[PDB]
Design a protein around this ligand. Structure first.
Ligand SMILES: Nc1ncnc2c1ncn2[C@@H]1O[C@H](COP(=O)(O)OP(=O)(O)OP(=O)(O)O)[C@@H](O)[C@H]1O
Ligand SMILES: Nc1ncnc2c1ncn2[C@@H]1O[C@H](COP(=O)(O)OP(=O)(O)OP(=O)(O)O)[C@@H](O)[C@H]1O
Ligand SMILES: Nc1ncnc2c1ncn2[C@@H]1O[C@H](COP(=O)(O)OP(=O)(O)O)[C@@H](O)[C@H]1O
Ligand SMILES: [Mg+2]
Ligand SMILES: [Mg+2]
Ligand SMILES: [Mg+2]
Lengths: 460, 173, 513, 52, 52, 85, 458
């Protein structure tokens, strides 16, 4: 039987009055007929007597005051395990690929507590990406968390497509892709890309596109985590990719005003750090299994001061910062070496060979950024000939960090390159010393290995 | 308007009146309480910021037709939240909730001229099957509809006036 | 001339034969307040959110707040005649607009009433203004061109059929000019056009329509208007009404191009509505849902796969993929992209074109900033000839501006740098183009070939403008079969490179700038 | 042509002035359910010539 | 020039339609006022209560 | 105008017997649960910063003593708490 | 019939019997001591309460006063009876002369003309002023806005436009004073009567002493007179003394009307309130309105909502800069921000269009060099960059001009400059014909011939 009634509808937020002895628990699901379509509501708050405030998992359009609401005595539960692989699901775990019923054996609530302190692991096994600036400046480890920070249009998506190509095909294990707040066009192109390259049977995709009501985008990330946690608890090693963490926080902002909270900070919900921490602290590698994750992070107006990007920086292990200031020059990948960093970059993992090479490159690019200020007004003749030489070899290293990706040929028109870590280190040492003092700057730009930068110089 | 804040008090009072099987009395008590609320001297006192208990016991003073054990309490609960102006709306919801509880409906009928008893029979007998409630008709025939009839129950309306057809036709322009 | 004066009576009189003597039933309320275009209604227990509520006269309101014990609703028109105690009837209806082929060449308001004075509408029924977009499995990848006719945009920032491309910049920088030239150029491409004017003054919409009619473009175009006098509800809905018209073509297997002029005026109308309804103000005083306003609007622009078309058309149309392309316009106050409405729309779209005042005052018109502009579809949208030539151009031109800054006081240039410091000026000069003068693909390709393959290098810079004009004139008289070949095919081969080389070699010898 | 429809409207007034005769179908043949006797047998032409 | 003329001709007919309909219903109202009957009034009531 | 813990069964109690101060000051009931804050009706002897014991051997700190209710913040998981506890 | 039930500043709430509640925008009337006060209805609240704005001082109002319901809006005299006269917002005579010989009164709240009614026109209207018709020329029947901060020259510029346009134009004119100085209303009226041109001009004044309801609705009184002359089939000139005061008087009442604040504390309705006023100021197939509006820019912030909304409404926009005016270059027009819909090769023709774009390009490049010059000095420039500066500085001086109305400040006599002389002068400077003259030769000279005569005496 249905036992509650809708008593307000304002935007996405619906209030339901139950009998005073059968009030739904927080995060319980509720069900109502929105005409022909069945609609689900998630309980956020218990307030007053018998009334509960809820977010609609779908459009509010066509709801009436007075509709009977069924009380489902469980939270939102989603299918998990192998049945998910090769399927596309929405936030409610319903198939949206037309292929038919998911055929699960088990379903798990999307709300669950994080691993306890005793269960965590520190197994920082180094992981190679094949991208020069990442493998040198911000080395990954298995089981860590990686963030790709940047404002609009700087390369987070094609970087994540390159990382998906290189590790995720090689990984030999399952993967989860969470399309949080993503463009529907790009979610389609990814699904066909995975199908045509015939790796889709390894990977399960959860998609919550922008057009979806604010409730869906608020919860779709937890559905992706819950599938990855099922494979981790099996004891598998899985990769988790998140389309954009920021859009989960933004969906929280949309509902928060209607949920009656007072505003904070740059108009963010007061609970911002709690909501971020409760999601992020589930994405960890325990003693039973490891989750490696790559998250894109939108940075509003490229202001890394903004509370949403500023808060997430603390939860990651490697952070790659993509800058429009570099991207304006067209020099993709547009990774800023002076801001990107990793927990793994110290001699006790990387060894001294790699550590010395990365610290060297940072010191040169730092020095050149001060010298560049003199040049623009006074001109370059006012430098010491040693500062002129550093300005030369820095301006080369800046170009040598560029690399064309074979997921970007459609933009470039040119063949993409892969580099080993070994070859990457040798190349930067060679610019830091004299071996390539005589090549032009343009002879480095979007080259590949150092061993072929000489060839572009001969062509230039 | 006091319609939202009257709702909680209206329900409490009705359920209590049911468990004490005294619904008719209460409705009389709430009517009395709603008339003292309108008195011009009391309307200044109710607007000024007296402390709740000094206001309530002064309110209880001007009613001696109230069931003190149950009816003074009601007044004291509303005074402690400043609500006494809601009493005329608490009354109307008590009457409304009572009629739902008695499964009974008032229905208003409007026509160009007075109806026959046989028409009033067919109207009532239809509406009881429409509503699945008992009905009690009232007829409020009108100067401006020139033929036909209107039937209003709750806020659902059925129109057969020629007035309504003349406009509903002109709408097809 | 008007023997129909007899026959309009028979049309009028048969209406009586259609009209119907049934008593219906409806749910009823009374207006309890009227202010600034918002009304509160008591009653309407059966009102639904987003329903059309009908008022005295032929006027309607949209139900938006369904609170306990009252409904709040916004009036789609002149509100000032309403009064307390007026009796108000809830229909069953959501908002629908006339839609069809017969809209082309008409000017209609957001409700779709014709305001051009060309008489009543021909239309193919009605469609909902609010509607869900095609899901992930129903789309197809964007890989066909829509030609702008502008050298800067079609080379650097290609737009494909089903893309969403933001045009962004300050006031009086050419935002509208670019978008109506993109309409004008579709006149023979087969792509239908929609222009939505939100919050503009009505004489500006007169002037635009008068330019579209001075070309052949208006007979390809629908114009949807909500002028600055019209209520905030009408402006807020006007983009959605335009999209519903574009979706008719998209679901048939035809292409449509929709321009939303000033999406920021749609947000301002939405802020007016929200504050008058007492919804809590978020940042910059906009409501929090304003992202959901623009994102649900713009995700309707999509390319759908053939299967979705067949299902929608019930097998009438088979094998054809339909597309809707959106070109929204945003005004920035001082180049400040960090404002709330610009940051939302930049997040949503598939790219942006930045137009800016410093370039426009310098005479770089169209004032497209190559660095901060980008297309996220890129080369998949171009024809192969443009794809081959243009890929080099935009990133080279950006680095020229960095190089030009670094160089600015240094007396000695190395010849790679000295060459770069010249080529980039000549490309910057080449991409300027006059308003209402769109160039075909072959005409753009030929002029870009002259720059990529170095034939400009010796020509002095002010002559580069005359060089281009003379080259287009020369090739149109003497070599038109190749122009037809390139415009029809978009093809590129060694014989195409050879024939273009022969044309540049022959022009530059035989002619005079 | 404008000067033609400006003339033709003056001609059209007489068809509008004629065809406003036929109002019994509108009123009576909707609302009285069965067809009606012409109780308005003078008031019909009274309406015609007074209103147009 | 020919498109402009035909469009104004189409407008004039829709204008003329607006003219008759208003004065027609305003006349048909008077047919009620001079052709209504108490048995017909009772016929309306008894019909609708039989299909309410 | 909005309701301030004016809920039907609490009102019905006061109707039945107004002097509910006859029940012990030591205890109360949860009347709202949201975002880790609970509102409690009763606890007439609560004091600023006092520990309130919740079911499941949990605690909350009493931070707002208001004229009708106590606002308290849950020192643990909160999502299973319910009104009427 | 009604009773006053609240008085909050300019706002008065009135209760009516629920069968009799006034419509929106009805006029009410109440006796306030020894005078009659009109109230305008803004909102219908519940329960027969209606919320209204006082067209006058609200002090001395009690609660419980009886209020009389007039069955109609505020209606003002219109037509030739208004010509040569000064009128109140309520359309009362404000000159000491007798009653206005009205034949008709019109309600001040009206709908804008339909999209079918509008008319296009491209007839360029000449001005005496070198910068304005070079950089931002405008047409008969178009709208012009003068944007500026406090004290930059909005009023002196509009007084030259009145002198140049409204005396070679032959038809009627309307001047609406909206929230400006009462001294300048009296000064303007006397120079009209002294020149015997007053009998062609209608003056509506609601100056800055007046309470907010007067300042808000006086704009609409002014338009309603101009709309009568336009619908009569005339060509009319409308001058609005400061449009910003209309919006500001909305801000002052909006909180008392109970509306949540928006943006920088503006009313939420700002763009609709401005838009419904602005759309009525349009030329039409029946007749034409040419309009000049002054637009105050608060705190010189051109990105404030009120200036920003006004920019989309207008056909030519002239922006006045404090930074230029403090040079003493007058008119202080910024040529890199001033713009017009009419600066188009088809309407102006190519020689004008090329000259304006040349001036714009040189002056832009001079802005790009000034940050170099500010630190390093000019000697570090290239010899072509020095020539751009040497020309740009001459151009900035030659944009200056002596105005006939400014003689009481400058003393030197006013100049009227033809469009043929302005394009010839700037085209000659940019061709470099005059690179042998000093900068002072160009300052405050009417025409380029006058510069060479000034140069002979330096
Ligand atoms: N390619 C071009 N070449 C020369 N002039 C141009 C070009 N494009 C636009 N203009 C001119 O720029 C001016 C403004 O153009 P437009 O009206 O499109 O700008 P806008 O940004 O839409 O202005 P608003 O912000 O008022 O809408 C017009 O005078 C127009 O003629
Ligand atoms: N062309 C000019 N020649 C000489 N002086 C001028 C000129 N234009 C403006 N000024 C000086 O600027 C001062 C103020 O100008 P004006 O009175 O027109 O400003 P305003 O529009 O009234 O500004 P506001 O309305 O904000 O007070 C006057 O002293 C005037 O002398
Ligand atoms: N590595 C790259 N190579 C070539 N082009 C790139 C690269 N990274 C970004 N771009 C350009 O920037 C555009 C947007 O980057 P993308 O990652 O798609 O957006 P976002 O960074 O917002 O996810 C791409 O379409 C392409 O034009
Ligand atoms: Mg992305
Ligand atoms: Mg524009
Ligand atoms: Mg002034």
């Amino acid at each position: 039987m249905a036992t509650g009634k809708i008593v307000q509808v304002i935007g996405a937020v619906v209030d339901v009055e139950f009998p005073q002895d059968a009030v739904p628990r927080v995060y319980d699901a509720l069900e109502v007929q929105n005409g022909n379509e069945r609609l689900v509501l998630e309980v956020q708050q218990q307030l007053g007597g018998g009334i509960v405030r809820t977010i609609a998992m779908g459009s509010s359009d066509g709801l009436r005051r007075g509709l009977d609401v069924k009380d489902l005595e469980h939270p939102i539960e989603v299918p998990v395990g192998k049945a998910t692989l090769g399927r596309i699901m929405n936030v409610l775990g319903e198939p949206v690929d037309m292929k038919g019923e998911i055929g699960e054996e088990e379903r798990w609530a999307i709300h669950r507590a994080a691993p306890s302190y005793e269960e965590l692991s520190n197994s920082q096994e180094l992981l190679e990406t094949g991208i020069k600036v990442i493998d040198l400046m911000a080395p990954f480890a298995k089981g860590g968390k990686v963030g790709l920070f940047g404002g609009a249009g700087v390369g987070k998506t094609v970087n994540m497509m390159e990382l998906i190509r290189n590790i995720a095909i090689e990984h030999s294990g399952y993967s989860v892709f969470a399309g949080v707040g993503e463009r529907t066009r790009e979610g389609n192109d990814f699904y066909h890309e995975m199908t045509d390259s015939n790796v889709i049977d390894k990977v399960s995709l959860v998609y919550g596109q922008m057009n979806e009501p604010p409730g869906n985008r608020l919860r779709v990330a937890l559905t992706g985590l819950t599938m990855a946690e099922k494979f981790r608890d099996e004891g598998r090693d899985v990769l988790l990719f998140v389309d954009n963490i920021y859009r989960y926080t933004l969906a929280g902002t949309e509902v928060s005003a209607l949920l009656g909270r007072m505003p904070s900070a740059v108009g963010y919900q007061p609970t911002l750090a709690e909501e971020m921490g409760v999601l992020q602290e589930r994405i960890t590698s325990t003693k039973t299994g490891s989750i490696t994750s790559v998250q894109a992070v939108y940075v509003p107006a490229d202001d890394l001061t903004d509370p949403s990007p500023a808060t997430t920086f603390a939860h990651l292990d490697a952070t790659v910062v993509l800058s429009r200031q570099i991207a304006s020059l067209g020099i993709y990948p547009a990774v800023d070496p002076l801001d990107s960093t990793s927990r793994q970059l110290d001699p006790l993992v990387v060894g001294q060979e790699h550590y010395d090479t990365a610290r060297g490159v940072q010191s040169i690019l730092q020095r050149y950024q001060e010298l560049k200020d003199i040049i623009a007004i006074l001109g370059m003749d006012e430098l010491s000939e040693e500062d002129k030489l550093v300005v030369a070899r820095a301006r080369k290293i800046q170009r040598f960090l560029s690399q064309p990706f074979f997921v970007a040929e459609v933009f470039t028109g040119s063949p993409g390159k892969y580099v080993s870590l070994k070859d990457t280190i040798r190349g930067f040492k060679g610019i830091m010393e004299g071996e390539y003092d005589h090549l032009p700057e343009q002879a480095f730009y979007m080259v590949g290995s150092i061993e072929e930068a000489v060839e572009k110089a001969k062509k230039l | 308007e006091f319609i939202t804040v009257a709702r909680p008090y209206a329900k409490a009072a009705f359920d209590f009146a049911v468990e004490h099987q005294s619904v008719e009395r209460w409705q009389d008590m709430l009517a009395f309480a709603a008339e003292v609320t309108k008195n011009e001297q009391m309307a200044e006192l109710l607007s000024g910021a007296l402390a709740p208990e000094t206001l309530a016991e002064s309110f209880i003073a001007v009613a001696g037709e109230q069931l003190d054990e149950n009816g003074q309490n009601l007044i004291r609960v509303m005074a402690e939240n400043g609500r006494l102006n809601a009493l005329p709306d608490v009354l109307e919801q008590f009457i409304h909730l009572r009629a739902v509880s008695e499964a009974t409906a008032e229905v208003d009928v409007i026509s160009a001229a007075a109806l026959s008893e046989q028409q009033l029979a067919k109207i009532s007998a239809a509406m009881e099957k429409r509503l699945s409630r008992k009905v009690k008709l009232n007829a409020k025939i009108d100067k401006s509809v020139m033929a036909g009839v209107i039937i209003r129950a709750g806020d659902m309306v059925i129109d057969g006036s020629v007035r309504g057809r003349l406009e509903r036709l002109a709408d097809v322009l | 001339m008007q023997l129909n004066s007899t026959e309009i009576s028979e049309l009028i009189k048969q209406r009586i034969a259609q009209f119907n003597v049934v008593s219906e039933a409806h749910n009823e309320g009374t207006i309890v307040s009227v202010s600034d275009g918002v009304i509160r209604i008591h009653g309407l227990a059966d009102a639904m959110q987003g329903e059309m509520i009908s008022l005295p006269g032929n006027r309607y309101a949209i139900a938006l707040n369904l609170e306990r014990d009252s409904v709040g609703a916004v009036v789609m028109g002149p509100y000032a005649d309403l009064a307390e105690g007026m009796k108000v009837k809830a229909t069953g209806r959501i908002l629908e607009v006339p839609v069809g082929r017969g809209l082309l060449g008409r000017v209609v308001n957001t409700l779709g009433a014709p305001i051009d004075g060309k008489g009543p509408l021909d239309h193919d029924g009605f469609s909902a203004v609010e509607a869900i977009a095609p899901g992930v499995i129903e789309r197809q990848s964007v890989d066909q061109p829509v030609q702008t006719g502008y050298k800067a945009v079609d080379s650097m920032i290609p737009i494909g059929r089903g893309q969403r491309e933001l045009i962004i910049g300050d006031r009086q920088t050419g935002k509208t000019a670019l978008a109506i030239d993109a309409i004008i150029n579709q006149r023979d491409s087969g792509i239908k056009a929609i222009y939505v004017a939100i919050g503009q003054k009505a004489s500006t919409i007169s002037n635009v329509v008068r330019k579209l009619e001075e070309h052949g473009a208006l007979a390809n175009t629908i114009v949807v208007v909500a002028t600055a006098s019209e209520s905030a509800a009408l402006q807020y809905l006007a983009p959605y009404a335009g999209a519903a018209m574009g979706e008719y073509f998209r679901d048939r297997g035809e292409d449509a191009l929709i321009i939303y002029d000033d999406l920021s005026k749609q947000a301002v109308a939405y802020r007016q509505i929200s504050l008058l309804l007492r919804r809590p103000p978020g940042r910059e005083a906009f409501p929090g849902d304003v992202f959901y306003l623009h994102s649900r609007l713009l995700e309707r622009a999509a390319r759908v796969n053939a299967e979705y078309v067949e299902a929608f058309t019930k097998g009438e149309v088979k094998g054809k993929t339909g597309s809707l392309t959106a070109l929204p316009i945003i005004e920035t106050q001082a180049g400040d992209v960090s404002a709330f409405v610009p940051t939302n729309v930049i997040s949503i779209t598939d790219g942006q074109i930045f137009l800016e005042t410093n370039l426009f005052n310098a005479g770089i018109r169209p004032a497209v900033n190559p660095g901060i502009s980008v297309s996220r579809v890129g080369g998949a949208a171009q024809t192969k000839i443009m794809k081959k030539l243009s890929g080099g151009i935009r990133t080279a031109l950006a680095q020229y501006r960095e190089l030009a800054a670094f160089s600015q006081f240094a007396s000695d240039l190395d010849d790679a740098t000295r060459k770069q410091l010249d080529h980039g000026q000549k490309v910057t000069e080449l991409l300027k183009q006059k308003q209402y003068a769109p160039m075909s693909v072959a005409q753009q390709s030929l002029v870009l070939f002259a720059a990529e393959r170095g034939y400009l290098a010796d020509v002095e810079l002010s002559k580069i403008g005359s060089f281009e004009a003379a080259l287009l004139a020369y090739v149109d008289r003497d070599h038109a079969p190749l122009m037809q070949e390139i415009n029809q095919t978009g093809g590129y081969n060694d014989e195409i490179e050879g024939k273009l080389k022969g044309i540049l070699d022959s022009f530059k010898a035989t002619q005079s700038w | 042509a404008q000067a033609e429809i400006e003339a033709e409207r003056k001609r059209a007034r007489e068809e509008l002035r004629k065809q406003v005769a036929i109002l019994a179908v509108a009123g009576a043949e909707k609302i009285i359910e069965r067809s009606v006797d012409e109780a308005a047998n003078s008031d019909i032409v009274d309406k015609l010539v007074a209103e147009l």
